[PDB]
Amino acid sequence: RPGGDTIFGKIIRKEIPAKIIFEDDRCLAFHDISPQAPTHFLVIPKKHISQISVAEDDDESLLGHLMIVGKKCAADLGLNKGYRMVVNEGSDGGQSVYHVHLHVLGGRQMHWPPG
Amino acid sequence: GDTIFGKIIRKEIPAKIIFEDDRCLAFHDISPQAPTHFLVIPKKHISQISVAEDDDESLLGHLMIVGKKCAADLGLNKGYRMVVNEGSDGGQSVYHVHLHVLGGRQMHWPPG
Ligand SMILES: Nc1nc(=O)c2ncn([C@@H]3O[C@H](CSP(=O)(O)O)[C@@H](O)[C@H]3O)c2[nH]1
Ligand SMILES: [Cl-]
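# chloride ion complex -> structure
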């Protein structure tokens, strides 16, 4: 079972349903089940990386691809006033699923500080 | 249009620089929102993530790898939050792409 057995690994393998926005050979974008903004989705690699703190130097293009896919999906979803991208690392970051993921939130004014 | 981050890259105004290479610069935010709050910015003037090109993919990932390495060097062993703001709803404060890295305290949900 490639991608691991976190919830996100199971979503990658179509074993648990998700509302998918975009999929390619590197990543998957799908809506967050507990949205914190009118639009709130996740972009995740298909390769399993537990957290950003352990990503390898060779993961650079993949991590950048998450952001490129994130911004393309945001435009496809009509987030013309903007959005916020978030990666949570570890306990202080609030991380609750140990498979790297980028949040994209929009459709309302986001506030500062970002949590 | 040039921005204050362009001036910082060109060393025309001071900033507390954490790391630099040939393609990016990391420095502490002048208005910190956490005990550790720094930025990683590309030297290439990409005004906002929404206009980043496909060929910029590796560079954007480089900002995150540099960010996570700087976070480790700054002692953020309990974690941190990375943020990119786009546009008015995103609260983007400077129209030069920048990755925020925040830690040294519990970050909360929602993230703004
Ligand atoms: N679509 C979806 N299906 C799930 O079965 C699930 N399970 C968690 N999630 C979201 O992933 C983030 C983890 S918290 P983090 O590690 O990003 O801090 C939170 O926004 C959840 O609502 C999920 N989303
Ligand atoms: Cl900003």
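# post-check
The CA atoms of residues 45 and 96 of chain B lie 6 Å apart.
Strands of chain B lie at 17-20, 24-28, 36-42, 80-86, 99-103.
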